Amino acid sequence: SQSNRELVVDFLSYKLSQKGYSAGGGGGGGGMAAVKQALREAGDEFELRYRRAFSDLTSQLHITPGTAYQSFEQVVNELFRDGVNWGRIVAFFSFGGALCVESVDKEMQVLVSRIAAWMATYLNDHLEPWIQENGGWDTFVELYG
Numbered sequence: 001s002q003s004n005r006e007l008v009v010d011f012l013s014y015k016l017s018q019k020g021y022s023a024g025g026g027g028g029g030g031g032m033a034a035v036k037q038a039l040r041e042a043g044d045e046f047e048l049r050y051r052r053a054f055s056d057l058t059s060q061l062h063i064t065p066g067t068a069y070q071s072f073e074q075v076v077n078e079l080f081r082d083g084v085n086w087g088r089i090v091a092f093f094s095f096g097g098a099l100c101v102e103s104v105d106k107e108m109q110v111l112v113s114r115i116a117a118w119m120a121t122y123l124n125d126h127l128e129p130w131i132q133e134n135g136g137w138d139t140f141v142e143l144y145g
């Protein structure tokens, strides 16, 4: 669903903007303004909390011009290996943002667009099914937002 794609572009932009960088922002364009906000906030606390499992994980996969989508999907699978939930859902995004920020550091913003697509796909072929069977996103905001 295009809706999801909007969240990715928005979340990614917010993550990049936090490090000074910039990109095609999405905090107002489409709809689901509440979802975007609730997500951004949820992402912040994500990194903050949790001592281990975060700084090392990001290193597990180093997105590269040669890297394939299959290599990125494997990292995501591990995240949702013991089921799926709003808690882990945020991880998916927080993980993508980190990759984008890294690509920029190595003068590879072009990769950013790629990560965005890779996320949109997995989002509509793994979590999408679950999200629909959990009160959609509206619930994520009602509980966490």
Ligand SMILES: CC(C)(CSc1ccccc1)Nc1ccc(S(=O)(=O)NC(=O)c2ccc(N3CCN(Cc4ccccc4-c4ccccc4)CC3)cc2)cc1[N+](=O)[O-]
Residues within 6 Å of the ligand: 042, 045, 046, 049, 050, 052, 053, 054, 057, 058, 075, 076, 078, 079, 080, 085, 086, 087, 088, 090, 091, 095, 144
């Ligand atoms: C109230 C508050 C606002 C507090 S902050 C918060 C805490 C946890 C999750 C979200 C928000 N939100 C809040 C509280 C509790 C909840 S909750 O549904 O009970 N969910 C959790 O507590 C929770 C979910 C997943 C977790 N890991 C992710 C993947 N693994 C490696 C791991 C750990 C960390 C990062 C990446 C990875 C990872 C990387 C690469 C591949 C796979 C996994 C191990 C650890 C740890 C805790 C959700 C939310 N939520 O917003 O969705």
